[PDB]
């Protein structure tokens, strides 16, 4: 056991944090001691306080923390079978989860490859695309194309398709310009012309549909995805959708691809898949992709993580997916978006604010200058909210269980850090 | 809910398995329905059968399945806090685990970066090495060197240091390290490293045991040589202990057989006792401080589920359970049982070698082992074995009794007998 003071001492000496230093941290981490529902208990000045998890712990906690149905699914599975190797063995949690994911994802995605993290699932999707074209006798189709503004994880291949300026740029991939928010057919015509020149060396287009999360919380018209589907079909390039942040209702559709009625050839999901309990991700592909890989000289997808298809993670994901589908989740997200829109409207008039935008249960204030976390974090904590701004963005992706009142507290805190920026 | 028959139906239609095809698998998976201690319950011909998990579920289940101390650590943490983002927050399970890992790993490893899988932890170690030399103003030091026979995961950078014969970055490979110590091999490794030193960020190897690449063992004195070569030529040394850690080779970490400390080390697999995916990359203070003072100012990596409290809490319990008992005597007794039980295999006509290292036992055969013959032969004897290439091997849970070890080795000998 450790007191909060001892936690901070160990942390400062021995723990790396995301995109951080050791011993140069201008702001040291805050100790979290409990989480329940939409609330985190954090230690502030040696006193525990409850604050709203406005970020859903980086998009994961869609049902909140410690939801009784998800806890019970985990403890039920734990009593039976914690984990067995997926080499030569299968089990009921993987089968239940695979069946669910195939039924609820865009039509045509009928096979499921489980992995342990989103970045790995993106690498599996790339491996699938590359082995597909090798199986078609076109091994020159080796590169990936994307548009700027994206984020796909931190492994070396995933990094090669992240926005180059938001990754300090590895494989040299093809980047189209930033897709705009409002639909401009000239953008799609130019994307096509750029892809056409590279078609013979391109295995896939990879994009985040409708919402680009970690790269800038930018939204784009779903009609762009119909254009990509059509360009990819006409030029013999696969289409991969990275729905690791957008899946499971977040943008108001079950998957963002559903806003456009398009099906990619390959899709990645993660994050909210387990309700934020455990790391799990999945890469889905069409029957054609699967059969082409399996019929190639290679004969098999050469990927297999040790903890593939972990029964505990699958069991809680089954419960999390069923809990979502068993409720009127579509109405719940619409009400969340309306609450975010009403709460963030005051921000439109603030002098440091450039844009306010909402899409499903995602709210964003974009500012004209970086927001200083040394100012933003205490301002938000004083208002009972945990917010984590980055670059010039103050944003929220709240749990689906937040009441109207909790949304008022979250948006009030966002507007106030925006007011403090100017 | 699904019966076993329905599980097999869904599985065959919708689930990819490791290193497999869809619809072309000559062998379909067996349904597992329970696991307790060293035993799995599998469905065979519609009936449940108990079999020993001789593989510890791919090296992870060192305390067996459903151990009460690990079950309870997980449920205790579940009642408090499932998960919080590690960006701007810290918590007691991560701190308790980092404190443990720093104290039990080779000396000088003082900082801990948690990730969700072994493959990712290997890429973090490569990122640490590359950012280290950039922080020293030597960004030409960009490549990795290893010896043949290795395996480090399936992500694209990890694949680049896998044995090429068993789109990728072009790394530097020394020949297969032999089992017996030969100073000529170390001299040749040194001569090859010397030619590339100005472009090498790190040497990366699995110490003492190379697992997935062939279950090959090598004399620990080679690691003393690598440490000295790396120190003299200013190349970082990275040990991948994802399979060898936590007592498996008879020492707590295989590097301890040599008394060597690398600059960077990866651990995983048995870290959680086989409950949950977790991995960690450790580095010295000097590596950490050089990266933090570099133009970057930070290690540019950070997975969503970094330092997951549930995974950390169960790992803390697994490590403390291992340290709280006389694990060294346990592993010596397990190794003695494997040696005694596998001795009969040496004289079999298809067997090329029998070798044991700690709680690892290997029969190397003169032909690839046919899983369609080996798997029922092993199940008929109450043992789950998963051969690969020409190897029949076991890495059993540390809780196996002498009789269970004898049952495992008797089953291994019998599949080896069937190969010829
Ligand atoms: C030292 C080290 N470094 C990194 C990693 C990656 O770690 P991760 O999987 O991403 O968590 C590992 C993972 N080893 N995994 C296995 O041995 C199993 N797949 C069994 C396995 C080994 N040969 C095989 C051949 C065919 C089928 C299964 C297997 C590691 O041993
Ligand atoms: C669509 C999609 N695809 C793949 C992955 C990889 O997923 P994984 O992390 O390997 O499981 C994710 C992960 N998003 N992660 C987060 O939002 C933050 N933790 C990262 C994060 C927080 N500040 C940052 C500043 C700069 C860059 C990244 C970050 C994803 O959104
Ligand atoms: Mg379908
Ligand atoms: Mg490898």
Q: What is the DSSP string of B264-319?
A: EEEE-GGGGTTSS--EEEEEEHHHHHHHHHSTT-S-----TTTT-HHHHHHHHHHH
Are residues B203 and B125 both part of a single domain? Answer: yes
Residue A131, CA distances (Å) to A10, A135, A276, A299, B70 in order: 45, 6, 32, 10, 40
Residue ending a domain, among A272, A307, A327, is A327
Please count the other Cβ atoms lying within 10 Å of the Cβ belonging to residue A403. 11
List the resolution, Å. 1.9
Are residues A156 and A232 both part of a single domain? Answer: yes
- Lining ligand 2 with CB less than 6 A are A 18-19, 58, 117-119, 122, 151-153, 166, 208, 213-214, 242, 244-245, 270, 390; B 87, 302-305
Residue A293, CA distances (Å) to A134, A288, A305, A306, B22 in order: 8, 8, 19, 22, 9
The domain spanning residue A171 has which CATH number?
Answer: 3.40.640.10
Are residues A26 and A74 both part of a single domain? Answer: no
Q: What totals of helices (H) and strands (E) does chain B contain, helices first?
A: 13, 17
Bridge pairing between strands B89-90 and A109-115 = unpaired
Half-sphere exposure of A236 (CA within 13 A, CB side): 12
Residue A251, CA distances (Å) to A17, A50, A226 in order: 29, 27, 17
Cβ–Cβ of A84/B120 closer than 8 Å? no
Are residues A182 and A216 both part of a single domain? Answer: yes
Task: For residue A218, give how far its alpha carbon lies from the nearest alpha carbon of chain B (Å).
Answer: 19
Spatial separation of the C-alpha atoms in residues B177 and B189, rounded to whole Å: 9
Distance of CA B325 from the midpoint of ligand 2 (Å): 40
User: Domain limits at A243?
Assistant: 67-327
DSSP annotation of B29: P
- Dihedrals phi, psi of B311, to nearest 5 degrees: -70, -40
Q: Is B152 helix (H, G, I), strand (E, B) or coil?
A: coil
Q: Is B253 helix (H, G, I), strand (E, B) or coil?
A: coil
Cβ–Cβ of A117/B118 closer than 8 Å? no
Q: Please, which residues have CB within 8 angstroms of residue B272's CB and are 6 or more apart in sequence?
A: B60, B278, B311, B314, B315, B318
Are residues A113 and A252 both part of a single domain? Answer: yes
Are residues B203 and B321 both part of a single domain? Answer: yes
Spatial separation of the C-alpha atoms in residues A78 and B373, rounded to whole Å: 33
Which residue of A59, A295, A312 is in closest CB contact with B276?
A312
- Which is nearest to A406 in space by CA: A336, A331, A327, A324? A336
Q: What is the DSSP string of B358-416?
A: SS-EEEEESS---HHHHHHHHHTTTEE---BTTEEEE---TT--HHHHHHHHHHHHHHH
Spatial separation of the C-alpha atoms in residues A184 and A189, rounded to whole Å: 9
Cβ–Cβ of A300/B20 closer than 8 Å? yes
Q: Is B143 helix (H, G, I), strand (E, B) or coil?
A: strand
Residue ending a domain, among B284, B308, B325, is B325
DSSP annotation of B37: B
φ/ψ bin of B45: left (φ > 0), alpha (ψ from -120 to 50), beta (otherwise): left
Spatial separation of the C-alpha atoms in residues A379 and B8, rounded to whole Å: 55
Q: Is A128 helix (H, G, I), strand (E, B) or coil?
A: helix
Q: CB of A105 within 8 Å of any CB in chain B?
A: no
Structural domain total, chain B = 2
Residue ending a domain, among B294, B325, B356, is B325
Cβ–Cβ of A154/B292 closer than 8 Å? no
Spatial separation of the C-alpha atoms in residues A196 and A194, rounded to whole Å: 5
Spatial separation of the C-alpha atoms in residues A114 and A268, rounded to whole Å: 10
List the single best residue of B241, B304, B370, B387 to mutate versus A (max A Cβ within 10 A): B304
Spatial separation of the C-alpha atoms in residues B79 and A277, rounded to whole Å: 12
- Which is nearest to B117 in space by CA: A154, A148, A206, A105? A154
Spatial separation of the C-alpha atoms in residues A74 and A78, rounded to whole Å: 6
Q: How far does CA A49 lie from the centroid of its chain? A: 28
Are residues A233 and A368 both part of a single domain? Answer: no
Cα angle value A95/A99/A102 (rounded, 5°): 135
Are residues A35 and A144 both part of a single domain? Answer: no
Are residues B352 and B226 both part of a single domain? Answer: no
Cβ–Cβ of A14/B98 closer than 8 Å? yes
Spatial separation of the C-alpha atoms in residues A93 and A273, rounded to whole Å: 14
Joined together, the tokens standing for residue A230 give: 């059509």
Are residues B128 and B235 both part of a single domain? Answer: yes
Buried b (16+ CB within 10 A) or exposed e, A47-76: eeeebbbbbbbbbbbbbbbbbeebbebbbe
Beta strands in A138-286 (DSSP E): 143-147, 174-176, 202-207, 211-212, 218-219, 238-242, 266-269, 281-286
Spatial separation of the C-alpha atoms in residues B41 and B50, rounded to whole Å: 5
Are residues A375 and A274 both part of a single domain? Answer: no
Joined together, the tokens standing for residue A345 give: 């409207």
The domain spanning residue B358 has which CATH number?
Answer: 3.90.1150.10
Spatial separation of the C-alpha atoms in residues B208 and B186, rounded to whole Å: 15
Please give the method by which this entry was determined: X-ray
User: For the CA atoms of A19, A23, A29, A32, what is the dihedral angle to 10 degrees?
Assistant: 110
Q: CB of B76 within 8 Å of any CB in chain A?
A: no
Are residues B84 and B107 both part of a single domain? Answer: yes
Residues of B with Cβ-Cβ distance to A246 under 8 angstroms: none
List the single best residue of B4, B5, B12, B17 to mutate versus A (max A Cβ within 10 A): B17
- First-last CA distance in chain B: 43
Q: CB of B13 within 8 Å of any CB in chain A?
A: yes
Report the greatest alpha carbon distance in chain B: 64
Indicate which residue's Cα is closest to atom 11 of ligand 2.
A118
Spatial separation of the C-alpha atoms in residues A106 and B232, rounded to whole Å: 57
Spatial separation of the C-alpha atoms in residues A154 and B85, rounded to whole Å: 16
Indicate which residue's Cα is closest to atom 24 of ligand 1.
B212
Q: Is B352 helix (H, G, I), strand (E, B) or coil?
A: strand
Q: Please name the residue ranges forming H helices in A105-201.
A: 118-135, 156-159, 185-198
Spatial separation of the C-alpha atoms in residues B96 and B100, rounded to whole Å: 6
Residues of B with Cβ-Cβ distance to A290 under 8 angstroms: 16, 22-23
Spatial separation of the C-alpha atoms in residues B360 and B211, rounded to whole Å: 10
Q: Is A192 helix (H, G, I), strand (E, B) or coil?
A: helix
Q: CB of A297 within 8 Å of any CB in chain B?
A: no
- Which is nearest to B288 in space by CA: B141, B76, B109, B409? B109
């Amino acid at each position: 056991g450790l007191t909060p003071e001892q936690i901070i001492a160990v942390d400062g000496a021995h723990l790396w944090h995301p995109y951080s230093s050791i011993g140069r941290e201008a702001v040291s981490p805050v100790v979290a001691v409990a989480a329940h529902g939409a609330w985190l208990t954090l230690i502030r000045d040696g006193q525990p306080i409850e604050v709203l998890d406005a970020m859903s712990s980086w998009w994961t906690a869609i049902h909140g923390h410690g939801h009784p149905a998800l806890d019970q699914a985990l403890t039920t599975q734990l009593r039976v079978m914690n984990h067995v190797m997926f080499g030569g063995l299968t089990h009921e949690p993987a089968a239940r989860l695979a069946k669910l994911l195939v039924d609820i994802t865009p039509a045509g995605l009928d096979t499921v490859f489980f992995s342990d993290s989103g970045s790995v699932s993106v690498e599996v999707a790339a491996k699938m695309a590359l082995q597909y074209w090798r199986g078609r006798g076109l091994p020159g189709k080796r590169r990936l194309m994307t548009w700027r503004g994206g984020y796909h994880g931190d492994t070396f291949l995933a990094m090669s398709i992240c926005d180059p300026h938001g990754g300090m740029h590895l494989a040299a991939q093809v980047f189209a310009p930033q897709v705009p928010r409002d639909y401009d057919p000239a953008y799609s015509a130019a994307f096509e012309a750029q892809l056409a020149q590279h078609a013979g060396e391109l295995a896939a287009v990879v994009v985040e549909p409708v919402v680009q999360g970690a790269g800038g919380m930018r939204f784009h018209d779903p009609r762009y995805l119909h254009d990509l589907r059509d360009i990819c079909r006409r030029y013999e390039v696969l289409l991969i959708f990275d729905e690791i942040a957008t899946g499971f209702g977040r943008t108001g559709a079950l998957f963002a691809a559903d806003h456009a009625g398009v099906s990619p050839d390959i899709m990645c999901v993660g994050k909210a898949l387990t309700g934020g309990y455990l790391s799990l991700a999945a890469t889905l592909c069409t029957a054609d992709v699967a059969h082409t890989i399996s019929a190639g000289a290679a004969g098999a997808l050469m990927h297999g993580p040790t903890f593939m298809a972990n029964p505990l993670a699958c069991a809680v994901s089954v419960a999390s997916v069923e809990l979502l589908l068993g409720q009127d989740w579509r109405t719940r997200i619409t009400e969340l978006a309306a609450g975010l829109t009403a709460g963030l409207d005051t921000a439109r008039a603030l002098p440091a604010v450039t844009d306010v935008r909402v899409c499903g249960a995602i709210g964003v204030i974009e500012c004209d200058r970086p927001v200083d976390l040394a100012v933003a974090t205490p301002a938000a904590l004083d208002r009972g909210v945990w917010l984590r701004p980055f670059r010039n963005l103050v944003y929220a992706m709240p749990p689906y269980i937040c009441t109207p009142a909790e949304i008022t507290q979250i948006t009030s805190a966002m507007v106030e850090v925006a007011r403090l920026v100017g």
